[PDB]
Design a binder for this molecule. Structure first.
Ligand SMILES: O=C(O)c1cc(OCCc2ccccc2)c(-n2cccc2)c(I)c1O
Ligand SMILES: [Zn+2]
Length: 196
């Protein structure tokens, strides 16, 4: 009733990577390695790199799912709040209840799990473009961490899993997410809190 968050590189050496976007007041998405935490604005592009040591088979896929970070909330499905699920901002593919969307990939599939009711979005693995060493997925987070009746200030993790064509686990990585109005300031504040 709780998805695993154990980091697992697996046979292909799977792991995530993030850009170095800085902490200026204008930044829309920024990743803190010290906190393993992504800070982003509502519905803005979040580039997440996928890295492997060797090529996985055709039909391998990459799934993203959010869970609450605190154990006392982990069994609760992470979903959009009562306002955002009704705001008719559909892209034509993501269900309006889903917090995490994939941007710009018509092969993305959205799952409402028939047993756990959890939401996820999954895309086929594609090899890097010529001249690149990794592949990037562009995610969007569709509610603020503060949204009342939804995340309600509770921290979340995103779990990224590499899966075979039948959904079996090949690799796993994860990161905390805060969706907020000023990611650069919040990253600076939280890194300062950690240093102190
Ligand atoms: O270097 C590589 O060949 C490489 C390959 C990758 O999967 C391609 C799977 C595949 C294989 C054959 C036909 C169609 C599709 C990925 N990849 C993409 C998302 C997660 C992993 C990465 I990153 C790589 O670097
Ligand atoms: Zn919301």
């Amino acid at each position: 009733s709780v998805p695993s968050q154990k980091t697992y590189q697996g046979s292909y050496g799977f792991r995530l990577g993030f850009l170095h976007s800085g902490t200026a007041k204008s930044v829309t998405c920024t990743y803190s390695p010290a906190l393993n935490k992504l800070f982003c604005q509502l519905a803005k592009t979040c580039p997440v790199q996928l890295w492997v040591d060797s090529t996985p088979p055709p039909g391998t896929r990459v799934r993203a799912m959010a869970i609450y970070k605190q154990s006392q909330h982990m069994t609760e499905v992470v979903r959009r709040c009562p306002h955002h699920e009704r705001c008719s901002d559909s892209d034509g593919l993501a269900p309006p209840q889903h917090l995490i969307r994939v941007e710009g990939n018509l092969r993305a599939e959205y799952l409402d799990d028939r047993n756990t009711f959890r939401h996820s979005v999954v895309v086929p693995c594609e090899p890097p473009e010529v001249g690149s060493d990794c592949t990037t997925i562009h995610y969007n987070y569709m509610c603020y961490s503060s949204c009342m009746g939804g995340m309600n200030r509770r921290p979340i993790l995103t779990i990224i899993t590499l899966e075979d064509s039948s959904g079996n686990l090949l690799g796993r990585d994860s990161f905390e997410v805060r969706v907020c109005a000023c990611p650069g300031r919040d990253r600076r504040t939280e890194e300062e809190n950690l240093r102190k």
